Design a protein around this ligand. Structure first.
Ligand SMILES: *[C@@H]1O[C@H](CO)[C@@H](O)[C@H](O)[C@H]1NC(C)=O
Ligand SMILES: *[C@@H]1O[C@H](CO)[C@@H](O)[C@H](O)[C@H]1NC(C)=O
Lengths: 44, 31
């Protein structure tokens, strides 16, 4: 139970309030691939 | 009627397609 509470607190703390929708910097490794090779849609 | 979940299949819970968020979910149930 303490482990679950700590995980919930961590993932509530690392949340952000406001987001925005690259330039010449190639960030395809950090972002989600166009064709997913994994079973998780949000994994990078 | 038992239903199949991602933490093993359960008896006594109904599936109603209701979505809650974080910091309102007591009984976190796993996954
Ligand atoms: C960014 O890097 C990936 C690495 O494989 C590459 O496939 C992709 O073409 C690169 N993007 C550009 C615009 O060169
Ligand atoms: C609940 O029912 C809907 C529609 O029958 C289904 O898509 C969904 O996967 C069910 N929930 C679970 C946890 O299986």
């Amino acid at each position: 139970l303490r482990q679950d509470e700590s995980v919930a607190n961590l993932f509530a703390n690392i949340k952000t309030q406001t987001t925005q929708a690259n330039g010449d910097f190639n960030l395809t490794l950090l972002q989600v691939p166009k064709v997913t090779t994994s079973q998780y849609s949000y994994r990078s | 009627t038992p239903i199949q979940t991602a933490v093993g299949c359960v008896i006594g819970l109904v599936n109603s397609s209701l979505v809650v968020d974080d910091d309102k979910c007591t009984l976190p149930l796993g996954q």
